[PDB]
Design a protein around this nucleic acid. Sequence first.
RNA 1: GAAGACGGUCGAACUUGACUAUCUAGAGGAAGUAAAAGUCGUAACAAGGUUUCCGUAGGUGAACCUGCGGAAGGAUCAUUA
RNA 2: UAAAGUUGCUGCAGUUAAAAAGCUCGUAGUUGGAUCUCUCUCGGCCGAAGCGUUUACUUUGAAAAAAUUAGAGUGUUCAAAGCAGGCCGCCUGGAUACCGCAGCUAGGAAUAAUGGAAUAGGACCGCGGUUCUAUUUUGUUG
RNA 3: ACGGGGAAUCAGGGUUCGAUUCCGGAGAGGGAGCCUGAGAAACGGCUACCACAUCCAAGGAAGGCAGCAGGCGCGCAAAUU
Lengths: 149, 262, 151, 141, 129
Amino acid sequence: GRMHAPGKGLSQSALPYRRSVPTWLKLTSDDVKEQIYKLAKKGLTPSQIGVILRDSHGVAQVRFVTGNKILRILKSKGLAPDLPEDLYHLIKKAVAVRKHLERNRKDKDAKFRLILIESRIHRLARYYKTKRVLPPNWKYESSTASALV
Amino acid sequence: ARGPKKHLKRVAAPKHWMLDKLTGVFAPRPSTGPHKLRECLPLIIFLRNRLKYALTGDEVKKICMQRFIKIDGKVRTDITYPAGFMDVISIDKTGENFRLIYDTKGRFAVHRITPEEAKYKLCKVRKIFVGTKGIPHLVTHDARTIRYPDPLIKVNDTIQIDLETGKITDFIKFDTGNLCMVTGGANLGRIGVITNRERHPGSFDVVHVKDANGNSFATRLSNIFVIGKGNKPWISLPRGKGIRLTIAEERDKRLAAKQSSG
Amino acid sequence: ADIQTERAYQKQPTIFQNKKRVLLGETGKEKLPRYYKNIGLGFKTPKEAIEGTYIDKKCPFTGNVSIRGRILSGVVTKMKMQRTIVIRRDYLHYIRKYNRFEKRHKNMSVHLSPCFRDVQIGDIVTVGECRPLSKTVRFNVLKVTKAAGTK
Amino acid sequence: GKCRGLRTARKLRSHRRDQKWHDKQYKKAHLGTALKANPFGGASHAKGIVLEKVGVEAKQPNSAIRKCVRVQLIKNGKKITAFVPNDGCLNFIEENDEVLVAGFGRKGHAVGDIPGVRFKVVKVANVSLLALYKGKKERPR
Amino acid sequence: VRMNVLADALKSINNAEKRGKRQVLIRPCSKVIVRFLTVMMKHGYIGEFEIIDDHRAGKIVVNLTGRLNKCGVISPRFDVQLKDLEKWQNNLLPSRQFGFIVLTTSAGIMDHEEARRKHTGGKILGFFF
RNA sequence: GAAGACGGUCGAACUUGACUAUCUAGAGGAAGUAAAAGUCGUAACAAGGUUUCCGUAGGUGAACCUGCGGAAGGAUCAUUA
RNA sequence: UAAAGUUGCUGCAGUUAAAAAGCUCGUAGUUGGAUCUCUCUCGGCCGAAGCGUUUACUUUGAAAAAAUUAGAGUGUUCAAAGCAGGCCGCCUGGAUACCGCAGCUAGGAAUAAUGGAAUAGGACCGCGGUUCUAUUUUGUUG
RNA sequence: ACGGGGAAUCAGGGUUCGAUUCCGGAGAGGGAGCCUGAGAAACGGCUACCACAUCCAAGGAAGGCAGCAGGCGCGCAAAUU
């Protein structure tokens, strides 16, 4: 179930058994990489890049075509964000709820949700510091959270 | 506490003396000497408990004070004198000589030797050092200091010394293929040929030994006492030739001996 | 990089540094002979010990100590003492009734010679037993292994 | 449920050690408060001086008068009421004499219909109550 | 969360045998699960099984011969010495005539009789009878 | 080279200051515990005759009563386009 | 102490019998998914030499006092015991096992673990370019 | 609470005990300080203080049974100068 909710959902993608490039894909690996670079230059996260490639151009999985994941490709050329995208979005949500709570001090549900969001941020940041994705002294603070977003 | 102890409780005595618990509270505390307290045999134990020449310690005292007992060619009047491995006990009045050799069960056997073999003994050397104007020295398991030894004699080798003159006659190097005896531990009393030595720097070395019947055992290097060059011994072995029998074969031999002899 | 930072002169007691020299054959500080030894058990002398200049009478390589006894290991946890560090040794102790183990640890204050520079908190260090060097110190760092999570 | 891990020995041991204090017998035998409150002080028997004879009424379901003696122990000076077991045995006891008193058989608990009495007289004047009862011995003069 | 996939596999097999079914679907599969099933099948308790290969973690469909009374896991996997094996068999097995304790030893995963034949102790995985 | 305060050391002791936990003395006050239809006087158990109980507040000549919120362990598993 | 599966590791119980915290985060603790099958010297099967990624196991091999306990033998008149006992001077015994954990040693690598290349800051090759040279030479030392 | 060897049921696991004859430690009424000696902070050695206590002609002198026996005391609880 969810880490911070009582829900137990089964919604997630079901990757097909075949790991091959589809027959309809006339796009070679290098064109896919170039489109990935262009989409990243437009200011899009790897999730958005994958969504656009799956939706408009038609790419079942970038890994099955280019052999590398989108974030790995971005890091290889060097276009990746300094901090990971999921951590960045969690920090963004924390900043949003903290800004809301300033003018809504009576919103005691917002305070609880902010506590849950910051717990998620701390867990993810600890994991990233374990794998050296973040500097060992990387700390999240309320007064500095909007400085990272 | 407060200086050395002078008594030995009978139950704290070495188990290879085969002392019984109902005789007394005390065991003969062996005097200081060339052999350690736990791996020696006091003269009273040999003269009374083994040879049965005396019934009490007073009779052992009478025998010893009659200057009848010679250990390594020297008359010893101390009844608790520690006699140990390879020590020669010569009783001239009765004309028999014994050599203290471990039996295969880890105990000093009553091993009678000819008077020709009572004129020498084998001594494992413990250290070699140079002192007093570049004069090499040699310390044995018998606490004997022999000056001017052969330069080829190194530690863990065993020399042969004549008892009358106290000088080195021959020596055996410590090497694979040489016959050896185990003087301590579980395999104490066993005789076999050295097959392999494992060196553990900073710790104890391990020597692997194989019997005549192919049984292989191991012990620490300090417990190895090489007897002869190759597989032949330089001294006479006890009734058992260093072979340790399993309890099954021991029982089988005992039953066969009971059957044959009536 | 002064070595004489104490009230008494610091020097290796074995090395004599007052030998007569030759004027026409000397231009600048020629050499100061360095005393070092190789400790046993296959431990290689670090380069910084052989070509260094530090004076450490408790150094296993350039000092008066002899390594003998237990060879242990641990992870560095504190480096707030002069030439001495605190290492932690973790182990599992068996409880027979429950057939299970419990985590336990012991901190050992060990001497770290200046031949081991840039040792970090979390590194695995191999220590050797020596004579009492202080009230609590009985081991000397013999080899420093960089942690897997290092640069 | 209980924890089942290879490294849970400390948790299991500490939980058992803490839960043992919720055992009545364990707490009684290890807290030491029941020991200081015990007039005998951990002893099986004690000697006391008979202060007076008292008759305690039996508990409600049955009616009788239980012949007891109030005794003061010599070791600690504590006051004790002890049952004199057999019949006529109260006549073998005189005021202000030494008696050997034991427990009543339930380890500090009252026994039977006698209320609040957990001690019984074994010997009086250094002769057993049974020898006096059976006539094997007479009271010393 | 799901830990000890072997426990789930054995519980599913036991539950399907209680219900009287002829086949049970086990997921996720694992090497230890396959070895335990092979030890079971060599003794005639479980019969043939097929490993379905999905590209993440296999599933196994196990035919069920009605011969199995109980299969269980032992958690944690206690280290068992050859001298403590008899106590484990007395604790776990219905009798000395039938029933097996499955150990994992450096010689592989096998039952207690084979582990005594090969003179190996190991870690207890489970049992079946 | 044979007695005795003194740059001193180890240091039992000894009075004086706080007034230290295992120990004891009095009329006390509050409470608990053992069977006792103890001088008009019933809270609960049935809808116990005001349904019971929980938390929290008052008040009482006693069980107790009352207000607020809650529970059914209720005396309703149900009440109709 | 057993009975007490009424202290439950084996092995208890927690709706109503005693009992799950009002609720949710959370650090330590505990637990954790699949997945890897002229490197080396005397004579064309040998000691040395091992960073195999340290380990945890498992199985050995040493070292672990005696007495006690288990246990072998031995008619104390039997037994508890003891370490002792015959044959018209000789034969023997005075064993063995176990001795937790932690240290020491040795196969195969199932199974908590630990993952050695990811800004490549990753074996092997030709360059010795100022240096130590079988602790520089190899007719009477240059 | 001296520690250990070890002791009290056998299902398996455990729970209790170990002052006690073997090993190690400590102490000799309580502390402290020493001489001799290889070895003692020794007490069947010494020197003090503290607590007890013996003879005295009242000046002084002499003490240390948790050694074997024996007494008293304490006790539910343990032997022959």
